Amino acid sequence: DKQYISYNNVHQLCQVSAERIKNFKPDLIIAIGGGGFIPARILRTFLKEPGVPTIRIFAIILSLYEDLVKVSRTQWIDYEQCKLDLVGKNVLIVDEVDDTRTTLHYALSELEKDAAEQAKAKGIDTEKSPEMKTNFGIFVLHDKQKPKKADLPAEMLNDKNRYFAAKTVPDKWYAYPWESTDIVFHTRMAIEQGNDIFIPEQ
Amino acid sequence: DKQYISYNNVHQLCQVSAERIKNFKPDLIIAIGGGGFIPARILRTFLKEPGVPTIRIFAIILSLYEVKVSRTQWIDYEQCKLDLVGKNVLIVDEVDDTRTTLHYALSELEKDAAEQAKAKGIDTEKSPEMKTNFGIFVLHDKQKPKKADLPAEMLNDKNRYFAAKTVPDKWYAYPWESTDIVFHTRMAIEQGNDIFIPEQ
Numbered sequence A: 001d002k003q004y005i006s007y008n009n010v011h012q013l014c015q016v017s018a019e020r021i022k023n024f025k026p027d028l029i030i031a032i033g034g035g036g037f038i039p040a041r042i043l044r045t046f047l048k049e050p051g052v053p054t055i056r057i058f059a060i061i062l063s064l065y066e067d068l069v070k071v072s073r074t075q076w077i078d079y080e081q082c083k084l085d086l087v088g089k090n091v092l093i094v095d096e097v098d099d100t101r102t103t104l105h106y107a108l109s110e111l112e113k114d115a116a117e118q119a120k121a122k123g124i125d126t127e128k129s130p131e132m133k134t135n136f137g138i139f140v141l142h143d144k145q146k147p148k149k150a151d152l153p154a155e156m157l158n159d160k161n162r163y164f165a166a167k168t169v170p171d172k173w174y175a176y177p178w179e180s181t182d183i184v185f186h187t188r189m190a191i192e193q194g195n196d197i198f199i200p201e202q
Numbered sequence B: 001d002k003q004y005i006s007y008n009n010v011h012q013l014c015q016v017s018a019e020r021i022k023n024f025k026p027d028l029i030i031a032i033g034g035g036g037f038i039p040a041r042i043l044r045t046f047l048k049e050p051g052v053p054t055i056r057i058f059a060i061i062l063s064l065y066e067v068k069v070s071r072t073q074w075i076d077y078e079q080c081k082l083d084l085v086g087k088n089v090l091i092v093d094e095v096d097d098t099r100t101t102l103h104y105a106l107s108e109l110e111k112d113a114a115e116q117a118k119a120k121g122i123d124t125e126k127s128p129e130m131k132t133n134f135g136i137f138v139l140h141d142k143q144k145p146k147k148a149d150l151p152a153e154m155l156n157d158k159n160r161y162f163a164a165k166t167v168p169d170k171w172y173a174y175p176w177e178s179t180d181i182v183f184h185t186r187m188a189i190e191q192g193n194d195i196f197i198p199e200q
């Protein structure tokens, strides 16, 4: 039962989620794919504080292939060039949907390798110096209620201030507005399905 | 006279612009900042051909200071296996105001292209066809005195410089910038800045 989601719905999902995510105090955002970036950018509008430098967003692409799951960093982050130091940072990973969780699992896994390798380059010892550890969190618009094919750490999933889903939803296909080649039809369906705005004008 | 722009307006600006941009045949897109990335991603939906790998989008951030250019977030070409040689590259931003941002973005990316051509032992004078072809797409190009220029072969080629709309010198409020999307959309509708293409 295909669920059509309007732009304004996504906007308001980000709006309400931002209030929760403030408790995580993200220092930067890493967005998975084009679908991750749009919510990430909208989120930033709601995280912005006047006089405070806007939170940086980094786009990454992960490709996963059948093993004999193999992971390829199709588009990654040049931490040195960007002067991005993950040590002692709160990092929010953003994607539009958590379906089987495979993508989020391997993205987190890869980013943890980056952080560990940086904390070692600095002659930092994350065991002796725990406060230099990187704190990862996740934000998705939709977390599907279904058997997952991959896990996420318990301290992530079971911490309401680390794993953030705007909505936990049935196992249905979600059609995002940026994916549509007929936004008029798409928005008409979204309104009919109750997938448009849910917060009134201020 | 602030102009409120709805999400659906942005979507349809990209839809019509894609028909023009197909003539440029972009191989990849480079999006400037968060405001560039959204139209870039929407454009990709309209450039997609089934059975053909999706066009890659790379995000960059340029900082310009009182001009001093800083590559705040750039592209690791080697890591991304991105070769600009012989490519048609579309640079995307949401707005061309004074043109300063586009001027320096193009300048910096051209340096990358030349650098990569030389590393491949390619004399672009002798083999002009291997040169990198840059194009630009913005949602709005403001009609006003510009503070920087773009190449004549860019600006005067309808198949290189693409503005969805050429507009008066007013401030454009994009939907992703809004903290009240309901007010924002109501204003956009009133202003005639919503949809302009019917359902299929």
Ligand SMILES: Nc1nc2c(ncn2[C@@H]2O[C@H](COP(=O)(O)O)[C@@H](O)[C@H]2O)c(=O)[nH]1
Pocket (backbone or CB within 6 Å): A035, A095, A097, A098, A099, A100, A101, A102, A103, A104, A172, A173, A174, A175, A176, A179
């Ligand atoms: N548009 C859309 N894409 C989905 C949906 N479910 C999964 N996907 C795509 O499948 C990918 C893999 O999701 P995963 O199963 O790894 O969590 C997602 O990144 C997304 O690209 C959906 O309901 N709607």
Ligand SMILES: Nc1nc2c(ncn2[C@@H]2O[C@H](COP(=O)(O)O)[C@@H](O)[C@H]2O)c(=O)[nH]1
Pocket (backbone or CB within 6 Å): B035, B093, B095, B096, B097, B098, B099, B100, B101, B102, B170, B171, B172, B173, B174, B177
């Ligand atoms: N939202 C919005 N931003 C603008 C507008 N005009 C200029 N800007 C911001 O100013 C930046 C510099 O524009 P430039 O003058 O270099 O073309 C743009 O990238 C954009 O971030 C506008 O009308 N609306």
Ligand SMILES: [Mg+2]
Pocket (backbone or CB within 6 Å): A032, A033, A034, A035, A036, A037, A095, A096
């Ligand atoms: Mg995604």
